[PDB]
Design a protein around this ligand. Structure first.
Ligand SMILES: CCc1noc(C)c1Cn1ccc(C)n1
Ligand SMILES: [Zn+2]
Ligand SMILES: [Zn+2]
Ligand SMILES: [Zn+2]
Ligand SMILES: [Zn+2]
Lengths: 76, 68
């Protein structure tokens, strides 16, 4: 029904929000510290000097294990 | 249709995975450091000395700003 299409759209949008803001391909699994923005995969987060969201200096990257992780890179 | 019911269940399970594993009421927004388990809201995370997933000591809690 049309209701099925509405639910599919909601699911798709939530799943897209879980992807890296730089490559758009890998799941987010890294936090810029100390600001806390958690918007990149490990590869894309590795070379950024400053946060792509708030411009704060990145002192280090903290890896995050989330319950919503479903990619092979994060389930292994 | 039956697919509407299946999709509602998938959405419910994804939304439950986004909620704190301790209180089940508030969204996850906190990481236990250094282990990295990101499974609690700020109120439950503040009250735990050990990670509830891996039992590692919590040195400190990092707030996470997620696209959620
Ligand atoms: C990076 C995780 C993420 N980004 O967008 C959504 C939606 C998520 C899923 N998520 C896991 C825990 C929480 C609060 N949201
Ligand atoms: Zn990336
Ligand atoms: Zn930031
Ligand atoms: Zn909680
Ligand atoms: Zn842990």
């Amino acid at each position: 029904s049309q209701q099925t299409r509405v639910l599919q759209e909601k699911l798709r949008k939530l799943k897209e929000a879980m992807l890296c803001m730089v490559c758009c391909e890998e799941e987010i699994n890294s936090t810029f510290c100390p600001c806390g923005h958690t918007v990149c995969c490990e590869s894309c987060a590795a070379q950024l000097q400053s946060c792509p969201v708030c411009r704060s200096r990145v002192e280090h990257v903290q890896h995050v294990y989330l319950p919503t992780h479903t990619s092979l890179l994060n389930l292994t």
